[PDB]
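agent: user wants the structure for SEC14 cytosolic factor from Saccharomyces cerevisiae. delegating to structure tool.
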Amino acid sequence: QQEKEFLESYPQNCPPDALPGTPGNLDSAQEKALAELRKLLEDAGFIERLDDSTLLRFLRARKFDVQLAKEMFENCEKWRKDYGTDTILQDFHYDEKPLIAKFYPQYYHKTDKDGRPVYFEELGAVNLHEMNKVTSEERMLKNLVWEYESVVQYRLPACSRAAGHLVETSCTIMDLKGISISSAYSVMSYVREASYISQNYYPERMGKFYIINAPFGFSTAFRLFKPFLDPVTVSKIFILGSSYQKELLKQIPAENLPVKFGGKSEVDESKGGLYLSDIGPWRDPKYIGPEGEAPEAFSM
Ligand SMILES: O=C(NCc1ccc2c(c1)OCO2)c1ncc(Br)cc1F
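agent: tool returned. relaying tokens verbatim.
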């Protein structure tokens, strides 16, 4: 089978200091639960996506409850059927991206110190009025699941090879510079849907989340209630104000961080600039495997 060929083409163990329940770091209890859940899925008829990394993501998502995790998996499979996710990399074509990239900037640029692909989202700059001139929110969400499928199929394997260990997760940087109460309400619908797709259909894919240029009240609230979030979440999520450069550089090598966020990585304006760039390990022949090089989101 070619799923066998694929998972053998990149490192499959997480580093030993990763949170427990991750691949390669399983205690006796968890080990039993994993094949127990697998058996049920096999019995239920599933053939696809029954690998350790996948099943453990759902397991870690339901505190290792084998039954709730089966529900989660089944629902996701149903969604993949209805939504058409298994074929989205062929069917969907976001050809309007060049026109609307400035309106809502979203790009993947290199990796962080743990080998995770970095996702940049400049939400603060969002201008939906201009965007809705050319696209719909239905189309914005397809592009989200398209990018997501790109990460799973092409970005994460390449990142795994480039780092020497399994990379299951992305590192998200969300820039609020420019956000207002007006525009906040205007993107709530999209963010809420994206959040639902993320948690329910792509569990445990979020590894680091940085919000930068947060407004004072938002920044403050997090600071005050920090002592009451569980320590696993408090190590994944960072809400930062206007001085985030040193915080980003602890997580992303300066050579991989865009100059505009305080690093050295540059992108030629000849290729459409950073808003249209997709640079990383997934574009390097040394780290591309039997999956082949990933697609590009648009024609040009
Ligand atoms: O969880 C993820 N990203 C974190 C995140 C960060 C901001 C968001 C969001 C999700 O959904 C809405 O806004 C996430 N990352 C990569 C892949 Br593939 C799937 C995902 F669900």
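agent: one observation worth passing along. The chain has two domains: 1-83, 84-300.
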